[PDB]
Paper text:
The widespread and highly conserved ParDE TA systems, part of the RelE/ParE superfamily, target DNA gyrase. M. tuberculosis encodes two ParDE systems and several studies on the ParE1 and ParE2 toxins have shown their ability to inhibit gyrase enzymes from E. coli, M. smegmatis and M. tuberculosis. Toxin-antitoxin (TA) systems are found in most bacterial genomes and generally comprise small bicistronic loci encoding a protein toxin and a protein or RNA antitoxin.
The ParDE2 crystal structure exists as a heterodimer containing a half-unresolved ParD2 antitoxin. β1/α1 and α2 form a hairpin structure which links to the anti-parallel β sheet core of β2–β4. The ParD2 antitoxin is comprised of α1 (E38–N49), α2 (D53–H55), α3 (I59–R69), with the N-terminal V2–H35 being unresolved in the crystal structure. The full ParDE2 complex structure is yet to be fully elucidated as the N-terminal dimerisation domain of ParD2 was cleaved during crystallisation.
Numbering used by the authors:
A (entry chain B): 36 to 71
B (entry chain A): 2 to 88
C-alpha cells in the first residue's frame, strides 16, 4: 500500500537470486534458531 | 501441487513486528508467528487466488487479530511469500 512497501514487495518479487528463496521448512527452522 | 518459497526479507519483516511484542508481550511472538506459518502453509495453499489483492498481481491475507498481513504472489506453479507488513 505505502509506496515504500510496494517497492519492497516488488523488489523481492523481482529478486531472481535463487539464494534468497528459502523453502518453508528451511525458513521455519531458521526462525526457531532465533529467540528459540 | 504448487511449490512454496519464501523470500528471506520476510524474516526481516517478522522480527520488525516481534519487536513491538518482546519484553512486554512475549506470548504474542509465538502466536503471531504460528498464525503466519498457518497462513503460509495451509490458508494460502488452500485457495491462493481467493484472498484480497494487495496491488497488481500481488495478494495478501491479514494474520488477524494482528494487523500484519502476508503479501504474496501466485503463479500456476508456485506461491512466493514476499513480505509481512503492517496495516
Ligand atoms: Cl479450492
Ligand atoms: Cl475465503
Amino acid at each position: 500500500i505505502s509506496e515504500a512497501n510496494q517497492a519492497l514487495i516488488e523488489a523481492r518479487a523481482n529478486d531472481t537470486d535463487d539464494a534468497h528463496w528459502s523453502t518453508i521448512d528451511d525458513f521455519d527452522k531458521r526462525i526457531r534458531a532465533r529467540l528459540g | 501441487t504448487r511449490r512454496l518459497r519464501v523470500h528471506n526479507g520476510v524474516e526481516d519483516d517478522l522480527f520488525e513486528a516481534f519487536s513491538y511484542y518482546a519484553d512486554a508481550a512475549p506470548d504474542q511472538i509465538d502466536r503471531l508467528y504460528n498464525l503466519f506459518v498457518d497462513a503460509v502453509t495451509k490458508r494460502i495453499p488452500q485457495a491462493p487466488n481467493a484472498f484480497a489483492p494487495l496491488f497488481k498481481h500481488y495478494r495478501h491475507i491479514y494474520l488477524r487479530p494482528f494487523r500484519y498481513y502476508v503479501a504474496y504472489r501466485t503463479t500456476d506453479e508456485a506461491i512466493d511469500i514476499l513480505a509481512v507488513r503492517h496495516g
